[PDB]
Structure 1
Amino acid sequence: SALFEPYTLKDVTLRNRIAIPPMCQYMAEDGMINDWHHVHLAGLARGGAGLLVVEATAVAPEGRITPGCAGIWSDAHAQAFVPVVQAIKAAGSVPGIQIAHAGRKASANRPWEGDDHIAADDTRGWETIAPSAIAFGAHLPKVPREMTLDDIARVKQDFVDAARRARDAGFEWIELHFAHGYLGQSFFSEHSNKRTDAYGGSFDNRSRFLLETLAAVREVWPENLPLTARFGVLEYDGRDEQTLEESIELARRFKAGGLDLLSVSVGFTIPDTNIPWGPAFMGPIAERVRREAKLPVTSAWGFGTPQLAEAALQANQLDLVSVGRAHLADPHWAYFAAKELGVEKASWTLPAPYAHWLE
């Protein structure tokens, strides 16, 4: 089975093509992770996936989505990851991390606590920053503060520091969060970026924050460990052909700038869209990016059906299959998938104290 073939990128070898994508847990306190995350992540690593990408981890306090978000904006925050990284490695999975800044979508409630911007008089909230002083709208009505050039320099440096910290905590894979309407995505999109300086207007200018951040991170991130990003390549906003063409051009520039793999997603930059949700609906778009940018890709949404993951790999739509919610339902999804696809000794997807009894 294609799903259970190893994958090598730079000096890192994944034992199979199952990636667990970043999934926010909303369980940190002042950015500090705790035994929620330790047990969650170590348990997932033991379930058999080849790569486990830690949830969106804020490069700066105001770049959290919510008061429960993980952070890596100080060395103490970074050191909290060390035992978890070591546990993921002990289980044979590759530890990755997504580093992030929520931009105008920051200062929001947890999804089961309203999912909306935090009220103005709530002591937990904070001012958001963005390319331009324009609200997302809907349940995220707060108008962000327009970033100064010094704010841009500071956030770039925050990404560099975060990557340096991730490296020194022992992560073997990094993902820059340039998707989902957060800060990076919002610099790229004309919907959110109305700047008239070097960071907005033209395609080169809208690309600039993302490319400069990638280049700055590349200076501290080891050349022998995969350097990746998540990026929303279309919005389903009636401008899809134009948007995908620009997004593919940016992917070519990312590749030229050292990006090893792109996690292909949707922008979610604005609320007024019509996304055609369905199982593996991203497969064809990911394939197009892969082909036109000649860059390895992953994508997500509905690949918890093992046959669909297998089909996408066999068709060369993707290089890795990201499986999210199915892993919240069953930490041992990889074992389920191995059984479904007829892998020999499927139970040995799991460690011996489980595998011996399930064979």
Structure 2
Amino acid sequence: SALFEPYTLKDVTLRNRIAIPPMCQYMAEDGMINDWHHVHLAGLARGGAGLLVVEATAVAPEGRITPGCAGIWSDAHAQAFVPVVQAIKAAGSVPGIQIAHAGRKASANRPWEGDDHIAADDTRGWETIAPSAIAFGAHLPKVPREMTLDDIARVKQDFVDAARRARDAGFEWIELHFAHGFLGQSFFSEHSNKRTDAYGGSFDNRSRFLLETLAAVREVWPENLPLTARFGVLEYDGRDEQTLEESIELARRFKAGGLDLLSVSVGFTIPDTNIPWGPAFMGPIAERVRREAKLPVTSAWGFGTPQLAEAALQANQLDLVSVGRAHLADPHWAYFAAKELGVEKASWTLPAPYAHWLE
């Protein structure tokens, strides 16, 4: 099976092509992770996936999505990850982390606590920042503060510090969160970026925050460990061919700047869109980016059906298959997939204290 073939990227070898993508847990306190995350992540690693990417972890307090988001904006925050990293490694999975800044979509409630911007008089809330003072709208009506050049320098440095911290905590894989309408994505999109300085207007200017952040992170992130990013390559906003073309150009510049793999997603930059949700619906777009930027890719949404994951790999649409919600439902999804695909000794996807009994 293609799904259970190993994958080598730089010095890191994944035992199979199953990636667990970043999934916010909303269980941290002032950015500090705790035994929620420890057990969640170690349990997933033991389930058999080759790569486990820790949830969006804020590079700065105001870059959290919610009051429950993880952070890595101090060395104490980073140190909290060390035992979890060590547990993921003990289980034979590769520990990754997504470092993030939520931009104008920050200061929101947890998804089961309203999922909306925090009310003005709620002591938990904070001012958001963005390339331009324009609200997302809908359930995220707060108008962000327009970033100064010093803010841009500071946030880039926060990404650098976060990457340094992730390195020193023992992560073997990093993902820059430039997708899903958060700060990076919003610098790229003309919907959200109305700047007239070096960081807006033209394609080069809109790309600049993302490329400069990648280059700055590259200085401190080891060359022998995969350097990746998530990026929304279209919005389903009636501008898809032009947006895709630009996104693919940016992917080429990412590759030239040392990016090893791109997690291809949707932008979610604005609410007024028409996304054609369906099983593996991003497969063909991921394939186009892979082909036209000549860059390894992953993607997500509905690949928890093992045969569909297998088909996407065999069609060379993807290099890794990201499987999210199916792993919340069943942390041992990789074992289920091995069984479904008829892999020999499927139960040994799991560690011996499980595998022996399930043969």
Q: 1:294: Cα distance to partner?
A: 0.1
- CA positional deviation for 1:345: 0.2
Cα shift at 1:127:
0.1
Query: Match of 2:95?
Result: 95
Question: 1:339 offset after TM fit, Å?
Answer: 0.1
**How far, CA to CA, are the matches of 2:125 and 2:280 in structure 1?**
36
| 3-state SS of 1:229 partner | strand
Provide structure 2 residue ranges, at least 5 long, that are not aligned to the other structure.
none
CA drift at 1:252: 0.1
Q: State the shift of 1:45 in Å.
A: 0.1
Shift in Å, 1:18:
0.0
1:284-328 CA-partner distances (Å, limit 9, x unpaired): 000000000000000000000000000000000000000000000
The match for 1:347 is 347
SS in 1 for 2:196: coil
Deviation at 1:247, TM superposition (A): 0.1
Task: Give me the whole-angstrom Cα distance separating, in 2, the residues matched to 1:107 and 1:301.
Answer: 25
Q: Aligned partners of 1:326, 1:282: CA distance in 2, in Å?
A: 17
Deviation at 1:213, TM superposition (A): 0.0
DSSP 3-state at the match of 1:3: coil
Cα deviation digits, residues 199-219 of structure 1 (max 9, x gap): 000000000000000000000
1:28-79: CA deviations, max 9, x gaps?
0000000000000000000000000000000000000000000000000000
- % same residue: 100
Deviations 1:3-43, CA, capped at 9 Å, x for gaps: 00000000000000000000000000000000000000000
Query: How far off is 1:337 after superposition?
Result: 0.0
Shift of 1:143: 0.2
> SS where residue 4 of structure 1 aligns?
coil
Note the C-alpha offset of 1:138. 0.0
Unaligned regions of 5+ residues in structure 1, if any? none
For 1:2, what is the secondary structure of its paired residue? coil
Instruction: Name the SS of the counterpart of 2:326 in structure 1.
Output: helix
TM, length-normalised to structure 1:
1.00
Alpha-carbon distance, 1:271 to partner: 0.1
For residues 226 and 357 of structure 2, the distance between their equivalents in structure 1, rounded to whole angstroms, comes to: 36
Q: How much has 1:119 moved relative to structure 2?
A: 0.3
1:333 offset after TM fit, Å?
A: 0.1
Q: Deviations over 1:186-243 (max 9, x none)?
A: 0000000000000000000000000000000000000000000000000000000000
Aligned structure 1 segments of 4 or more residues deviating by more than 2 angstroms: none
C-alpha distance in 2 between matches for 1:51 and 1:36? 19
Q: Distance in 2 between matches of 1:277 and 1:31?
A: 32
- Alpha-carbon deviations, 1:154-208, whole Å to 9, x = none? 0000000000000000000000000000000000000000000000000000000
How far does the alpha carbon of each residue in 1:102-127 deviate from its partner, in whole angstroms, 9 at most, with x for none? Answer: 00000000000000000000000000
Aligned counterparts of 2:270 and 2:233: Cα–Cα separation in 1: 14
Kindly state the Cα deviation for residue 142 of structure 1 after the two structures are TM-superposed: 0.1
The two structures have a TM-score, normalised by structure 2, of 1.00
Q: Hey, what does 2:120 align to over in structure 1?
A: 120
1: distance between equivalents of 2:157 and 2:134? Answer: 24
